[PDB]
Symmetry: C2
Subunit: 806 residues, 2 copies
């Protein structure tokens, strides 16, 4: 559960003290000095003479155009957290301002705790300076290695979705979400503005969006900064916000004056937020206007105004590095030396090199710190889900009526299971879906919870299962759902989210980024505890898009997921639910797991059930298993072909083809691969099937016919070094489809039962079976003409039931 | 179910024709002429010469100060109903404007249909004129004998509650509720203004309040007319209305100019109403501002301006009768003759005396007429409730563990029964309660319906079971609830309403009025079909008001109900539920009944159960029955006393006293009277117990001890001519109570078990039982001192269970 920390939502009821703002100004100066020492210096952190070009880095990498503004906001937020005792997580949208975050971690004392070799003295300062963006050092962005970070910020557009996710079901947590003005042009964040219509001020926390409007992107100005102030305020008010505006640094006003003005503006905003929270305890049915801060400052605000006669401060020329070579001229080194001395570090550091005590007296202590906040490290919060007994949801008719029974929909079983998980776990488990929960048949959870909706209600003929609080969030944006769930998991909670297969590509970037958060975490960051897994139910898949057609058919999610399987990280799982029982086993395993991205590919269509629960779990631990009840060959020597399958429709076609093969006396084996990554190379993947086990499943000399859900490229690229891999003949999706009957969909991809039987016959003896092969091939065309003439699939195809049903 | 009539909520989308307003003016003139002929004329309706004082009534009775304004509004509403085809019921708040209603019934043709002897010619006009307020004629007010009337209007303050009741669950019905400005000063109607917060524009109809602000009461001006127009509009807007205002007749403007102006204003109001209705089909969660019309006119608007030098028109002098004696002077007769000729009746009537055809061409036809509308005669709409099987709700533990078992609450059984009646009958059965449904334990109906509430919603920690539509209405006003239910029944629907016993007095007037609507209906009005019964669950009665005390104890409802039992009308039923099974039988009988007021007095406290369902019904058909299982005497000769009871606490005390009497060998009988009115005189009440049956129940010579719920006066006034009535010793409530333990409440009223045993012993032998009587009397005082010392009742009293429990 999310803990209550400090004294949440308290008003100051006093002026901001002068001593605190003294401390805030000194903090800002020292944070800018650290952020510059990290970029430019490799030695001599405190500029003991001789300070020469020997002390400067050979290759200057990093960013400065956002760092002083971030340091300003972070120092003021630190004063605020010390004063109010607020439970606060900062989300840094422009993550390229990494030196700001590392300077915070260093100054609040958490960096030395996490990394003991970076001491708080001259040698520790030298190591801290050298390690930024260095061989064998720390990254340039706001990284998982950086304490106090739940968001990398490298790939832009997801500060707001992550903020609204982090506050969900989390009522005491305050999140200032700093948003770059260039990042605000990206598609994800524009729609992430509208997510205050999906949170409740009573049951969820408060997100304060700080638009960091410094006017410029890389080498280009931002649209928001160059439209009129009337337009900007009107725009933010049309999205349910009260815009506040702060402008600074565009004239010669004293810094103390700027800090004072910001103190007053910040406390005004905090009082509006506290009023909203206090009102929500009585009335939470009508939405408030949350304050949001527009923070207009010059880009690179403390750097030299002009360098080489080019406007540097207040321009895009300060984005990455002013003084691109302070190492190769004497004039640029003098500019750099003057820039470092303009902060007066001589008074901010003591003799031994530690930041002076009066510079950090205004700082929060203990669990209130940014790097120490448990919501930033959501693995220490996390507790296991309390799971219902799986045998309660098993489809038992397979156990007595025989394999292949029924016309059930696989995802309804997961719906019931997830409903009871929600029942056992309220306020820790949440279901997201881009308008598609009821189309993936996960609506059984409406028996115990509602869709959280905080826009207007109009009627009850149209607004069923909607409520101002709920455990089902549903907005038509995959970016929103994925950011919500990722921030939900990163804070310590659990969740599933469902989607159409073809639109998972919309978040290929986001998944990639999350994999990079996991790949980095499992490799080099032990102090970050495991978080829950990102569970993605992929349904309404390529083979059954009757209503939509070719635009909704693209199973390429498997390919993008296969690219993140390296160095024994195991941060990826791709599971194929052949039926409801296998889906139960997969979902149980996935809900128990940690630090992974689990894509469970299950169909919503009426499909037969093949396994019992014990059989399903037994197939699960191996990933691939032989179906002894479907095989006609007792041992590996007898079979004239191995028929392997991965996916519900490929499984159905393999089984129907096996029925026809039985009538011709063909001895074959039947294999089902539930988990794709078990087929990976044994030396590469230590949890994949060993080579002996793989050869036992697939006969070394005998041909293997493989029917696969996605593109066959993904199977062939995975088994390349496996034994008997030359004989594998993968049949997968082949970018051929439309709106048409279900048999046609598999016909045009050469994955129907007739084509599979003909493929197996050709693997054995093309000459002996020539007449039967011809008969099958002309039957495919007759059965297509049947669907054209009559509008539905052939009775031979529709009515087929496996021979193993009693 | 409420029928859909005509084409509801249709906009005209055209100007009001000139021909229609020609007709409206001619209608208004002829309606005023009829309303004056009724008051003043007994002969010569069309003033054929010689028109002399012979033609005038000897005793002029009736009212005129509201009649021409009512005729104006009714003629315009008639034009509106003809044009739009609206389902409309008019509620006439100032019911003393009876000639207006009878003139309408006469002019739209329904009066001749209902009363064939009032033809539409000269003789019929003469009879119509003479019969108003005459010996052997029709009443002065807007009476049940008057077609098109659901509201008498004699006793003021309930036009608005009746309107909002008539539109409930009735979505196509339009109700213009005409409200007198003096009547608006009464307490009931002031709170009946606020009832637009309890109706839904989608599921309920539309009430248009027309404030008939003619400035004067009887001999006094009204508060609303003499406050500023700003105040009046501000007041009506603070109650959720849009005030429209029409002013007429206060200058020399032409009548047509007034009819035209009213046509535009009326169509504007209708368009706002139609907009509200169309919006409600999409959004019904947010309350609209319903239009209401302020209709400022001079009182007695077409009468002579001055009579005897006194301002008559536009004054309170025109309330009842200008020209109080047009029979006793020649000058007043000339004033009357000029008044009648000012309407030019010579052109409004043909030779034979019928109203000319062009005067009524604009009139509605068929079912759309006011007197023909089925919602005015709610007995033709009515259908029986579909009732669940009673045996499903029986308390079966009495059948096997023995009589006297348990500590159940009686009203929870009725709650479950009513819940299933609601389930079987949605939109035809409704539960009302003055904030007291959950305190009478009728909340089992929240399993199938909600409280209808259309004010604001704030949270869900406080707003459970509330919804913009529902079958439970609940406002803290007994007037509101009773008017809602009475208009609900008068329109054809069914309902229960619950209340504390002591506050039923708040509606003694209203009940009286409804009884007068029923007494008149069952005697002389056959064409009015039976309506459902007014069912009043009286709970939280006098004997168990622990929290409240003396202010909440007044059982005087029985007395006011007994005053309406005359002439074999049977419009009253008073039932005492001794336990849950008897309550089931009573409620089943009451829900089946028609044209009655059924007061069911049941306790909400934990009380023992004495009867099985079959026994309860067997006691029910007789009203009084002997308990053979509790009697120690086999025949009427053996018993030395008869112990009779009526009420759950009196029943408990009789049974506990019978237990003590058994230990002393006393032979007694036990009688329970479920229905009070069976004890009435046989010759007076043909459905009461005959004299032989009464003597069989109560032994002729043997003393009878009667324990009664209410004041003993009510029992003694009922059995006065019955045999053995001299020996009856009634023990009832005696205005002695407080906040104290339950035994104390019956102690201070001489109705406890010890005092009852002593009473019975004194009836037999005071001398023989002197020691035992003394012991009982001092035990009462010891058991009171026990409660004073320890705070709860004696173990001898609390723990007592009947000896018949196995
Ligand atoms: C989607 C995406 N496109 C491009 C980039 C490359 N990039 C890195 S930083 C940056 C500019 C930062 O813009 P802004 O939000 O205005 O930041 P600031 O002014 O704080 O530097 C860009 C385009 C990116 N990170 N993500
Ligand atoms: C509660 C109540 N008190 C007193 C009366 C006696 N009464 C009969 S008519 C009347 C005056 C009518 O007043 P208002 O509503 O202004 O009627 P209008 O101006 O239409 O005559 C009164 C007081 C009554 N009917 N009801
Ligand atoms: Mg920018
Ligand atoms: Mg008046």
């Amino acid at each position: 559960t999310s803990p209550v920390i400090g004294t949440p939502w308290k008003k100051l009821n006093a002026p901001v003290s002068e001593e605190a703002l003294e401390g805030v100004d000194k903090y800002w100066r020292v944070a800018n000095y650290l952020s510059i020492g990290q970029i430019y210096l490799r030695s001599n952190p405190l500029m003991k003479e001789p300070f020469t070009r020997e002390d400067v880095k050979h290759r200057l990498v990093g960013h400065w155009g956002t760092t002083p503004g971030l340091n300003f906001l972070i120092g003021h937020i630190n004063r605020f957290i010390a004063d109010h005792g607020q439970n606060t997580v900062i989300i840094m949208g422009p993550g390229h301002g990494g030196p700001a975050g590392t300077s915070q971690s260093y100054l609040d004392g958490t960096y030395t705790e996490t990394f003991p070799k970076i001491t708080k003295d001259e040698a520790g300062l030298q190591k801290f300076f050298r390690q930024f963006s260095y061989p064998g050092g720390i990254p340039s962005h706001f990284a998982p290695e950086t304490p106090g970070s739940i968001h990398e910020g490298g790939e832009l557009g997801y500060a707001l979705s992550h903020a609204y996710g982090a506050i969900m079901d989390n009522p005491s947590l305050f999140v200032p979400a700093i948003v770059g003005d260039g990042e605000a042009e990206t598609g994800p964040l524009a729609t992430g503005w509208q997510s205050n219509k999906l949170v409740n001020p009573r049951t969820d926390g408060i997100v304060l969006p700080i638009l960091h409007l410094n006017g410029y992107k890389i080498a280009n100005p931002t649209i928001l900064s160059r439209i009129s102030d009337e337009e900007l305020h009107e725009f933010f008010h049309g999205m349910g916000y009260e815009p506040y505006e702060f402008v600074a640094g565009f004239d010669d006003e004293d810094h103390m004056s700027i800090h004072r003005r910001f103190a007053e503006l910040w406390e005004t905003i905090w009082d509006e937020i506290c009023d909203i929270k206090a009102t929500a305890q009585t009335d939470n049915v009508h939405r408030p206007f949350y304050p949001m801060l527009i923070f207009r400052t010059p880009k690179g605000w403390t750097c030299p105004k002009y360098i080489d006669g080019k406007k540097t401060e207040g321009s895009w020329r300060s984005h990455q590095v002013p003084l691109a070579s302070a190492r190769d001229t004497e004039a640029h080194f003098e500019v750099l030396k003057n820039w470092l001395e303009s902060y007066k570090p001589e008074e901010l550091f003591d003799a031994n090199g530690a930041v002076k005590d009066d510079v950090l007296a205004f700082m929060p202590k203990g669990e209130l710190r940014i790097g120490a906040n448990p919501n930033a490290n959501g693995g220490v919060i996390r507790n296991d889900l309390k799971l219902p007994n799986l045998e309660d949801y098993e489809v038992k008719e397979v156990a007595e009526y025989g394999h292949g029974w029924g016309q059930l929909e696989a995802t309804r079983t997961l719906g019931a299971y997830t409903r009871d998980i929600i029942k056992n776990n309220p306020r820790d488990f949440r279901i997201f879906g881009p308008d598609e929960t009821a189309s993936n048949r996960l609506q059984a959870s409406y028996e115990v919870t509602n869709k959280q909706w905080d826009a207007g209600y109009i009627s009850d003929e149209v607004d069923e299962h909607m409520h101002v609080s709920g455990q089902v969030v549903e907005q038509l944006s995959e970016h929103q759902m994925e950011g919500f769930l990722e921030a939900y998991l990163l804070t310590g909670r659990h969740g599933i989210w469902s989607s159409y297969e073809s639109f998972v590509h919309v978040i290929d970037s986001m998944l990639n980024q999350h994999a990079k958060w996991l790949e980095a975490t499992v490799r080099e960051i032990p102090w970050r505890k495991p978080i829950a897994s990102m569970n993605l139910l992929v349904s309404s898949h390529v083979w059954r898009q009757d209503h939509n057609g070719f635009s909704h058919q693209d199973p390429g999610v498997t390919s993008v997921l296969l690219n993140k399987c390296f160095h024994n990280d195991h941060v990826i799982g791709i599971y194929f639910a052949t039926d409801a029982n296998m889906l139960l086993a997969i979902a149980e395993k996935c809900y128990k797991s940690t630090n992974k991205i689990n894509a469970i590919i299950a169909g919503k269509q009426p499909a037969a059930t093949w396994l019992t629960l014990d059989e399903a779990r037994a197939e699960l631990e191996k990933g691939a298993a032989a179906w002894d009840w479907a095989s006609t060959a007792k041992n590996n020597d007898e079979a004239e072909v191995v028929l392997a399958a991965a996916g519900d429709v490929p499984t159905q076609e393999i089984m129907a083809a096996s029925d026809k093969l039985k009538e011709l006396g063909v001895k074959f084996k039947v294999v089902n691969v539930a988990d794709l990554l078990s087929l990976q190379s044994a030396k590469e993947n230590d949890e994949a099937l060993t080579d002996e086990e793989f050869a036992d499943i697939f006969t070394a000399d005998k041909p293997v016919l493989f029917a696969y859900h996605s593109y066959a490229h993904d199977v062939r690229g995975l088994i390349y070094d496996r034994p008997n891999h030359d004989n594998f003949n993968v049949h997968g999706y082949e970018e051929e489809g439309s709106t048409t009957t279900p048999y046609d969909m598999v016909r045009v991809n050469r994955i129907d039962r007739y084509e599979l039987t003909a493929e197996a016959l050709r693997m054995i003896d093309a000459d002996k079976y020539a007449d039967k092969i011809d008969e099958l091939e002309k039957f495919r065309d007759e059965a297509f003409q049947f669907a054209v003439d009559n509008g539905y699939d052939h009775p031979d195809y529709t009515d087929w039931v496996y021979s193993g049903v009693n």
